[PDB]
Amino acid sequence: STGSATTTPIDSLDDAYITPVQIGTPAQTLNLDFDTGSSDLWVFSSETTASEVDGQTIYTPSKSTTAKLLSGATWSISYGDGSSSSGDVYTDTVSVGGLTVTGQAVESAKKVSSSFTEDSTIDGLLGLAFSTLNTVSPTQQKTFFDNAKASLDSPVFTADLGYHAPGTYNFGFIDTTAYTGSITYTAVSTKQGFWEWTSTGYAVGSGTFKSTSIDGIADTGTTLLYLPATVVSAYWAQVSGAKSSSSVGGYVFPCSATLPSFTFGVGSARIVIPGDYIDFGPISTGSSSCFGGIQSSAGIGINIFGDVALKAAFVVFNGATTPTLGFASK
Numbered sequence: 001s002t003g004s005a006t007t008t009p010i011d012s013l014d015d016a017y018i019t020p021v022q023i024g025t026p027a028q029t030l031n032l033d034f035d036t037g038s039s040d041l042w043v044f045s046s047e048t049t050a051s052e053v054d055g056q057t058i059y060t061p062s063k064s065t066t067a068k069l070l071s072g073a074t075w076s077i078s079y080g081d082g083s084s085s086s087g088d089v090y091t092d093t094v095s096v097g098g099l100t101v102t103g104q105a106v107e108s109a110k111k112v113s114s115s116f117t118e119d120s121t122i123d124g125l126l127g128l129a130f131s132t133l134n135t136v137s138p139t140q141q142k143t144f145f146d147n148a149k150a151s152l153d154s155p156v157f158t159a160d161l162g163y164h165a166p167g168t169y170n171f172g173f174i175d176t177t178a179y180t181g182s183i184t185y186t187a188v189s190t191k192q193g194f195w196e197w198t199s200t201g202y203a204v205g206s207g208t209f210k211s212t213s214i215d216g217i218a219d220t221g222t223t224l225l226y227l228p229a230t231v232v233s234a235y236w237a238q239v240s241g242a243k244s245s246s247s248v249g250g251y252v253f254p255c256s257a258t259l260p261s262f263t264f265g266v267g268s269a270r271i272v273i274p275g276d277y278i279d280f281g282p283i284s285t286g287s288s289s290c291f292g293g294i295q296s297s298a299g300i301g302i303n304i305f306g307d308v309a310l311k312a313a314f315v316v317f318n319g320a321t322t323p324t325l326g327f328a329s330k
């Protein structure tokens with residue numbers, strides 16, 4: 001089997017992407033944030049505290065003939081940005097772009113933190129990291145990808161995120177028309193539950209490539225590109241007026257600036273992030289200070305190849321027995 005679904009930015013900055021997902025029988029369609037940095041499929045639901053729901057579409061398991069309470073199971077998750085959610089668990093039929101999994105754990109939120117409530121466009125998350133990170137207790141549950149894997153034509157999914165435009169998540173096949181050149185594959189460590197890999201270096205604009213190992217995770221659920229302070233300082237030093245602002249919480253730059261591109265290494269290959277991808281616009285409405293799309297990972301404990309990086313590439317998440325990551329230009 002295979003599946004193919006369009007993923008759409010939630011706003012004009014590409015802060016996140018939502019993908020329609022069918023849950024239950026008859027189908028209830030929710031728009032979920034596919035997150036290669038976590039492993040829970042959770043949704044706003046009929047059980048979510050009413051004051052914490054504001055415009056989201058909810059899953060109502062009592063209206064699904066295939067929903068079953070997973071007795072005794074609870075979940076609770078905290079994300080890198082400080083947001084959180086928790087609740088109980090059903091199993092139900094879940095389909096993405098034509099690919100159906102039966103008995104998928106669908107984690108129903110009883111509580112969500114304010115940042116979820118405040119974002120009307122995201123009805124929940126669909127985790128695509130390794131199932132070892134799933135938070136369901138006392139019986140850990142599998143991700144949608146893990147459940148689908150044996151059925152898939154090939155045990156892979158691909159992320160093809162757009163810049164200020166829709167893109168595609170495919171399951172079970174590699175669309176050879178969706179990228180240019182060849183896909184370069186690189187080793188993955190699953191030891192921490194993430195799609196963790198090592199970039200071979202970087203360049204800023206038309207500068208020389210610096211060969212240096214940068215360990216990081218491929219994370220579709222993180223907006224920005226978080227890299228070591230040395231690398232980030234080298235980048236922003238090429239933008240007149242750029243500075244790290246403790247008040248704003250990172251690098252800002254004059255909105256009048258042109259940004260240089262940023263290149264990262266994948267083995268001997270190179271992925272070029274155009275300068276415009278690194279512009280996240282005014283820090284507040286009407287400001288002439290703009291927020292940078294490349295920020296320091298110092299104090300995160302790991303580097304994060306988030307959407308800013310991933311959307312410059314066609315990315316293969318290969319879940320074969322020995323997982324790997326593939327990157328192509330597009």
Ligand SMILES: NC[C@@H](O)c1ccc(Br)cc1
Pocket residue numbers: 035036037038078079080081217219220221222300302303304
């Ligand atoms: N996208 C999931 C989010 O919780 C996350 C943020 C940062 C890191 Br490191 C891992 C995961």
